Amino acid sequence: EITCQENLPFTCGNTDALNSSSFSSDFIFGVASSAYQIEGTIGRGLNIWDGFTHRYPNKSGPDHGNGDTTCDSFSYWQKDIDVLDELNATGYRFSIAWSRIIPRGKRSRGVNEKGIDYYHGLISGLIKKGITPFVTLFHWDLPQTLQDEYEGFLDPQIIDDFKDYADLCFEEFGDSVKYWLTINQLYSVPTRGYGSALDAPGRCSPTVDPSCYAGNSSTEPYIVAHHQLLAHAKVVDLYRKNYTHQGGKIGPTMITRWFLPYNDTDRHSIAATERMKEFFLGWFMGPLTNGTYPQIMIDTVGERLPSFSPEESNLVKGSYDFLGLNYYFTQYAQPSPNPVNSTNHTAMMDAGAKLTYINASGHYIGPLFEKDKADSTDNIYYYPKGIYSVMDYFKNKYYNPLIYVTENGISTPGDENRNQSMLDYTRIDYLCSHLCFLNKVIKEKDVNVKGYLAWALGDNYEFNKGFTVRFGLSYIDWNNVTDRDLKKSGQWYQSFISP
Amino acid sequence: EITCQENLPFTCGNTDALNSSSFSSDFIFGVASSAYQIEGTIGRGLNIWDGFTHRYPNKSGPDHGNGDTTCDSFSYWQKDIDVLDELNATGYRFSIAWSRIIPRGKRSRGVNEKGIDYYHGLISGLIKKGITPFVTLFHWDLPQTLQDEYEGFLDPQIIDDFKDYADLCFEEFGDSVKYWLTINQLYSVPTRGYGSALDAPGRCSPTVDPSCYAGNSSTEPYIVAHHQLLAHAKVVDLYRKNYTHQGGKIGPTMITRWFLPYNDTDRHSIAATERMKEFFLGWFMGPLTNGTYPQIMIDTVGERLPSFSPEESNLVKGSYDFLGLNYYFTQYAQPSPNPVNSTNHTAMMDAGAKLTYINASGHYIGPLFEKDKADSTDNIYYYPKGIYSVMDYFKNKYYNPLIYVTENGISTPGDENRNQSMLDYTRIDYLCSHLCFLNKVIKEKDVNVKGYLAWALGDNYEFNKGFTVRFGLSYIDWNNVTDRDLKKSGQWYQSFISP
């Protein structure tokens, strides 16, 4: 019988008690990254994260930091491989920058053969060290041209452009890459890119944020989510019909959270909690397992929710060989009004729920996950058991999928000095506490989880935060980015992997 | 009788001997700038100088500097006005960033009303201080979307997109702006952007520079020049047919140089010198005054030189109310082979001339203009009399045009410290020596020159050089860009203006 801790202090950092041998022998362990965050703009065209961070600098991070140079994994990809080799990692999740291989967005406009060669060299170097690539086709960095031509995922033109890009990636890399991810965290671009305008492209309703260049927070998140599902499904169809000879697998990436009632004896809170599961997970998992949105969304969102045609429904239903599930934290849910006629209405208000990290009797859900210096009441707290609850729910509700945990990790402040940043015991605690629960859910519930990829290989540009936080298991000095030095977390993960 | 110096030392910095009263009372004196160089990316979409400087960082400057933040004239436009007010300047030449008012390039895709308001506030603040705006519609910063859609000025689609952009600028600002410039220095984008790939967009033949993403240095400069002439002419037609009620004037900007024979008793050198005038100036002045390219270009360039249809010829011929002439230096010309079959052939080799600053008997043409630390044999030298020769030639060869000198200036090293940078006596010498010759040519040859705009108002991002050189008459500290402090040159120019 496995026991896992939920509260500080944790003791799971002792590899005598928890290590890779705790898991099945074929389980994959590694880390993850994304192209905008690590490569730099050298050698590629511009994308909407270049556009957004330059047009709206105060939304790029408090330091106005961006991915222009970052850790220069364009130049130093071999040092990333060296980190992985040092870890004895068996998987690496990275993303291809669409603007690096098709700068002009539409494939017929030409390919960047030097960009293709960059990924070929990376992929070959990973395989040569025994590392299995998990490659994300689209980690948010859409070519700027496509956003300016037709507003990217707001328009159905995105489907064919995304299909032709994927085709190119399968053609060029699929003989070596056997695990593909389509779109990073389905929920994020519709809500943050088109709803609150915290993320690129930065669209919203005028009274939500006067700085947005255009948008409608109440309708656009649904149109964009719809198109993401259709673009994903068209790419999976292409992969499974035209690249079956490669013997690989493909799936979407979901952002997962667990949700608990703010007040677990109040029926209103309990109902808000179940609504959250449907609005947050079901928005995409409904269509991916059934070809339809959840009925509560159909009922609430009404005319704002697009419909799938019978053909589209069939294309989207079952459009995965696995699910890449990112997991970071859990929230409590309580009821909140949905003012659909307010000029500041957003799609996120349609779930009729307010989300917190503290419940009605004052309990904070778990240890500190992210301190918010402008407002401490907005600090984020984590909950190790949420990864068990999420995996169990996916097995039970969503037809026992094959799952890879594609991201899991925690930041530490960018204000810390190098010595403090290297002594990242809070990261060891976060990672081990989640891995204990992950092993427990695989053993107790038989969830088909086959790998884990911690976020992040090394320090990088963090969406929305610049360089003001660090998520790496290896440290990077912003005054000289060549080296990636394992932190205490990296050193612990090395021992967990090869105990 | 006016005497002007050609060699150091100069004595024209004494305002008792040369000042604004030397010139006609209505003559305009000011300074110039350009949007990419001064504004920053805040509040605008991305353009090909963002694209090029980010994709090819070593071509942005030796320091990899770019226009991301620069002197932040988005925030500090009022400080620019304050510099001009301090100078008692009567003209300011600045450019509109197409990506600030039409981020998506094509007008039908929407306008950025906040961008329009930025220029309205600038324009109103200039007029309120008695400063006449001279506004450049296109100072190289093409929206990236247009370059990715159809390769910008490589395609004839540019004509209508440029026309619709100009229309917007005339509609919004023309009630206050009475001097418009279409395209900055016609010669530069075709040769440097599509020939040597030193400038955005960075196209060339593969063996000219392996880093170019695509191109053909032998044909593309001619196609791009052609389209520039057609786009310019369509915009002038639009202005003169639909905005005559505004009572303004419009013209192109030419980069001018004078050319002298490397050996002035050698017929081959003399012929190379006359070829240079035709290839450098005539390439555009031929079509602008006659609707046809020069016959030597027709003969040499053959099938690579596009033809104007009778309609196009008529549109381009006479398509100016004035000429904005930039002038910085002069070169000696000697013969050079034109290897049209070489894979590294460029359009610039078609003139059959090699250009130097030293003649056959070892004479350097004038004082140092730009030191080249990698190769001193590549130092640039200036020649004050060249501005007299250029203005005289334009009056004689090109039908006595109205002319405004739209740029004239000199850099000083970015390695100098603040005190050294403020003591910019070399700049006073450069500016006064050229102004002496300009007054002399207006008096002796009756050239219709009506204003002078020194380059630059303040230190900025310099195309190709980053922040490694400074051209301002006012200093900007890169660690805190708010202030613009008049240098000795600025202080001298103030006294020259109001002696």
Ligand SMILES: *[C@@H]1O[C@H](CO)[C@@H](O[C@@H]2O[C@H](CO)[C@@H](O[C@@H]3O[C@H](CO)[C@@H](O)[C@H](O[C@H]4O[C@H](CO)[C@@H](O)[C@H](O)[C@@H]4O)[C@@H]3O[C@@H]3OC[C@@H](O)[C@H](O)[C@H]3O)[C@H](O)[C@H]2NC(C)=O)[C@H](O[C@@H]2O[C@@H](C)[C@@H](O)[C@@H](O)[C@@H]2O)[C@H]1NC(C)=O
């Ligand atoms: C898995 O996919 C199944 C479809 O392949 C889902 O079953 C379908 O569920 C829908 C309701 O969502 C049932 O459709 C209703 O059919 C009646 C009977 O003819 C309707 O009037 C009703 O339409 C009205 O309600 C709609 C909101 O639901 C409004 O949009 C519409 O304007 C009407 O006001 C609806 O009819 C649909 O109306 C909209 C049309 O565009 C659409 O094509 C039309 O079908 C439908 O009969 C049912 N199909 C089958 C084959 O059973 C299934 O839904 C789950 O199960 C069903 C039994 C219900 O309990 C659902 O509430 C529940 O979601 C879904 N499974 C999951 C878990 O989502």
Ligand SMILES: *[C@@H]1O[C@H](CO)[C@@H](O[C@@H]2O[C@H](CO)[C@@H](O[C@@H]3O[C@H](CO)[C@@H](O)[C@H](O[C@H]4O[C@H](CO)[C@@H](O)[C@H](O)[C@@H]4O)[C@@H]3O[C@@H]3OC[C@@H](O)[C@H](O)[C@H]3O)[C@H](O)[C@H]2NC(C)=O)[C@H](O[C@@H]2O[C@@H](C)[C@@H](O)[C@@H](O)[C@@H]2O)[C@H]1NC(C)=O
């Ligand atoms: C100002 O614009 C005037 C036109 O409005 C120029 O005059 C025209 O000059 C052209 C030559 O450039 C004369 O055209 C020739 O006409 C004969 C007689 O019919 C031709 O065969 C000759 O064509 C051959 O040579 C061409 C290279 O010039 C090749 O491209 C072509 O394949 C032939 O091999 C040329 O005919 C032209 O051929 C190309 C067709 O596309 C074109 O439409 C056709 O006209 C032309 O007659 C003349 N027009 C008039 C009305 O005079 C004028 O040129 C200047 O003056 C003329 C007298 C010549 O001295 C030119 O050399 C000199 O440039 C130009 N002015 C300036 C200063 O450029």
Ligand SMILES: *[C@@H]1O[C@H](CO)[C@@H](O[C@@H]2O[C@H](CO)[C@@H](O[C@@H]3O[C@H](CO)[C@@H](O)[C@H](O)[C@@H]3O[C@@H]3OC[C@@H](O)[C@H](O)[C@H]3O)[C@H](O)[C@H]2NC(C)=O)[C@H](O[C@@H]2O[C@@H](C)[C@@H](O)[C@@H](O)[C@@H]2O)[C@H]1NC(C)=O
């Ligand atoms: C968890 O949710 C539960 C269920 O909602 C909360 O318990 C309820 O709390 C209500 C107070 O918010 C109780 O109602 C009140 O009852 C007193 C005593 O009779 C009465 O004077 C009130 O005015 C009020 O009555 C309601 O008034 C509004 C009417 O529309 C409604 O019909 C009335 O019921 C309610 O009795 C109680 N329900 C139960 C099943 O216990 C619970 O609140 C916490 O515990 C209760 C016992 C009470 O001590 C609250 O102060 C305390 O906050 C909430 N838990 C937390 C931690 O917030």
Ligand SMILES: *[C@@H]1O[C@H](CO)[C@@H](O[C@@H]2O[C@H](CO)[C@@H](O[C@@H]3O[C@H](CO)[C@@H](O)[C@H](O)[C@@H]3O[C@@H]3OC[C@@H](O)[C@H](O)[C@H]3O)[C@H](O)[C@H]2NC(C)=O)[C@H](O[C@@H]2O[C@@H](C)[C@@H](O)[C@@H](O)[C@@H]2O)[C@H]1NC(C)=O
């Ligand atoms: C400015 O250009 C002029 C005109 O080209 C240069 O003058 C010419 O310089 C040539 C040498 O480069 C002279 O030709 C030579 O004459 C000597 C004496 O007879 C003879 O031994 C040579 O081998 C050579 O002759 C040529 O050989 C090649 C044949 O194809 C051709 O037909 C022959 O002429 C030439 O006479 C001279 N022309 C004139 C009109 O003076 C001038 O060069 C400078 O001055 C000349 C006088 C001489 O001292 C050169 O050394 C000196 O560089 C050049 N000026 C500069 C500063 O480069």
Ligand SMILES: *[C@@H]1O[C@H](CO)[C@@H](O[C@@H]2O[C@H](CO)[C@H](O)[C@H](O)[C@H]2NC(C)=O)[C@H](O)[C@H]1NC(C)=O
């Ligand atoms: C978001 O886009 C929705 C739908 O286009 C707008 O909501 C609509 O408002 C128009 C004008 O009132 C209609 O009258 C509809 O009744 C209503 N439609 C639905 C489906 O709600 C909404 O106003 C607009 N939001 C903003 C901020 O532009």
Ligand SMILES: *[C@@H]1O[C@H](CO)[C@@H](O[C@@H]2O[C@H](CO)[C@H](O)[C@H](O)[C@H]2NC(C)=O)[C@H](O)[C@H]1NC(C)=O
């Ligand atoms: C530049 O583009 C020109 C014209 O398309 C190419 O020059 C041509 O080369 C093709 C193949 O040899 C032809 O055979 C032509 O005779 C010749 N045309 C002319 C007008 O010169 C040139 O090869 C190409 N340059 C590069 C570097 O791609």
Ligand SMILES: *[C@@H]1O[C@H](CO)[C@@H](O)[C@H](O)[C@H]1NC(C)=O
């Ligand atoms: C690994 O952890 C297991 C418990 O899951 C423990 O029994 C085993 O001894 C540990 N392996 C090493 C080498 O410490």
Ligand SMILES: *[C@@H]1O[C@H](CO)[C@@H](O)[C@H](O)[C@H]1NC(C)=O
């Ligand atoms: C941040 O930038 C936007 C312009 O992009 C502006 O609306 C807003 O005032 C700025 N925010 C703060 C808090 O200064």
Ligand SMILES: *[C@@H]1O[C@H](CO)[C@@H](O)[C@H](O)[C@H]1NC(C)=O
């Ligand atoms: C499969 O590839 C073939 C050949 O290029 C093409 O005809 C077919 O449309 C492709 N697509 C899908 C998604 O099946």
Ligand SMILES: *[C@@H]1O[C@H](CO)[C@@H](O)[C@H](O)[C@H]1NC(C)=O
């Ligand atoms: C608009 O929404 C903000 C946040 O969503 C909220 O604080 C405010 O009360 C709302 N105002 C109106 C008029 O509904």
Ligand SMILES: *[C@@H]1O[C@H](CO)[C@@H](O)[C@H](O)[C@H]1NC(C)=O
């Ligand atoms: C920066 O880091 C690399 C790797 O440690 C080192 O070899 C190089 O000398 C350093 N560069 C400077 C300028 O300090």
Ligand SMILES: *[C@@H]1O[C@H](CO)[C@@H](O)[C@H](O)[C@H]1NC(C)=O
């Ligand atoms: C790498 O992991 C394999 C598999 O568990 C193990 O046998 C090998 O010794 C490890 N290598 C190192 C250097 O830790």
Ligand SMILES: *[C@@H]1O[C@H](CO)[C@@H](O)[C@H](O)[C@H]1NC(C)=O
């Ligand atoms: C200006 O220069 C002229 C010579 O061009 C001179 O005669 C006049 O006195 C000077 N004005 C002043 C105020 O020094």
Ligand SMILES: *[C@@H]1O[C@H](CO)[C@@H](O)[C@H](O)[C@H]1NC(C)=O
């Ligand atoms: C500069 O960058 C280009 C890639 O954009 C590369 O071809 C070249 O080697 C670099 N130049 C130097 C001198 O290092």
Ligand SMILES: *[C@@H]1O[C@H](CO)[C@@H](O)[C@H](O)[C@H]1NC(C)=O
């Ligand atoms: C003039 O503006 C009118 C009205 O918009 C339009 O019909 C005409 O095509 C325009 N163009 C030019 C360049 O004359």
Ligand SMILES: *[C@@H]1O[C@H](CO)[C@@H](O)[C@H](O)[C@H]1NC(C)=O
């Ligand atoms: C190619 O041109 C470079 C510069 O234009 C020159 O140095 C070289 O000799 C040329 N090579 C050939 C093969 O023509």
